[PDB]
């Protein structure tokens, strides 16, 4: 053990941090009058409708 033959010192480190995420949203509010353009075999009604508003510059 003389002459620092067995003296030793070591250190080590390892680090990892990952993360992730996502999100989506949508809202819609209004009222629209549509018209029936087809009646299906079970009585369900296909409906289509369009509202066009022009206010000033569009």
């Amino acid at each position: 053990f003389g002459n620092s033959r067995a003296d030793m010192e070591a250190s080590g480190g390892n680090s990892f941090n990952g993360k992730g995420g996502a999100n989506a949203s949508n809202t819609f509010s209004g009222t629209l009058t549509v018209t029936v353009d087809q009646v299906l075999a079970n009585g369900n009604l296909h409906v289509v409708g369009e509202k066009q508003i022009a206010i000033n510059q569009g």
């Binding site: 629209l32 509202k51 022009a54 000033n56």
Partner: protein
């Protein structure tokens, strides 16, 4: 001069007792509210600015 134009299709049974129907019960509602005079021309983009808004890289 300001113009308010309306067009659409109305169900007779949606009309109230005072001969009125809200605009949300009209099927193909076309609503327009426009004007003329220098007040209306002051709300139009210049031709160069419109050209840039449509063709500028950013």
């Amino acid at each position: 001069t300001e113009f308010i134009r309306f067009s659409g299709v109305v169900n007779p049974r949606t009309i109230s007792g005072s001969n009125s129907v809200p605009s949300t019960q009209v099927a193909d509602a076309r609503i327009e509210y426009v004007g003329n005079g220098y007040i209306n021309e002051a709300q139009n983009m210049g031709w160069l600015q419109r050209f840039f808004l449509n063709l500028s890289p950013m």
